[PDB]
Amino acid sequence: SGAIYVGNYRVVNRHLATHNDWANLVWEDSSRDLLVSSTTAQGCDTIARCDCQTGVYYCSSRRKHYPVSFSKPSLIFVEASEYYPARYQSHLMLAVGHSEPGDCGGILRCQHGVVGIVSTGGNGLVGFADVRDLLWLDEE
Ligand SMILES: [Zn+2]
């Protein structure tokens, strides 16, 4: 589990979104496994605005933050998981590392802020849903 809290936005994995998230929906995209809902309270996370390919992610299933290199956001074929069939997922970045279903929502961060959240895992790879192209999170 996990979210990003920026301004009056909450960013979560679409497959973990709550009723309150859908009841306060701003934007959602199945292909990216992302959903954004509106918040009453201001959040304090900063979204990275950059093309970094190195950062650190949180892996809840190891209680550890791991430094990783990660690929550029792309359309990646993902094997079936407990929460999606095998499919193409867009705006996804891969690293070599551990990721189980419960790790979804863990933050990937670089020097500029939050890059994205864990979304995929298996075959010794971790996949992160990028948020750096969602420039509207910074405003309004
Ligand atoms: Zn960066």
Q: Quick check: 123 and 56 in contact, CB under 8 A?
A: no
**Amino acid at residue number 133:** D
Spot the catalytic one: 21, 33, 45, 130. 33
21 is catalytic: no
DSSP letters for 3-66:
-EEEEEEEEEEGGG--HHHHHTEEEEEGGGTEEEEEEEEEEEPPBP-S---EEEEEEGGGTEEE
112 is in an annotated binding site: yes
DSSP letters for 88-139:
EEEEEEEEES---GGGTTPEEEETTEEEEEEEEEETTEEEEEE-TT-GGGG-
CA distance 80 to 90: 15
CB 124: neighbour CB atoms within 10 A? Answer: 10
Q: Quick check: 70 and 63 in contact, CB under 8 A?
A: no
Domain range summary for the chain, segments of one domain joined by +: 3-44, 45-140
CB 7: neighbour CB atoms within 10 A? Answer: 17
65 is catalytic: no
Q: Quick check: 93 and 127 in contact, CB under 8 A?
A: yes
How far does residue 114's CA lie from ligand 1's centre (Å)? Answer: 8
CA distance 140 to 7: 8
Residues in the chain: 140
Q: Quick check: 50 and 133 in contact, CB under 8 A?
A: no
50 is in an annotated binding site: yes
Q: Quick check: 82 and 15 in contact, CB under 8 A?
A: no
59 is catalytic: no
How far does residue 27's CA lie from ligand 1's centre (Å)? Answer: 24
CA distance 3 to 34: 10
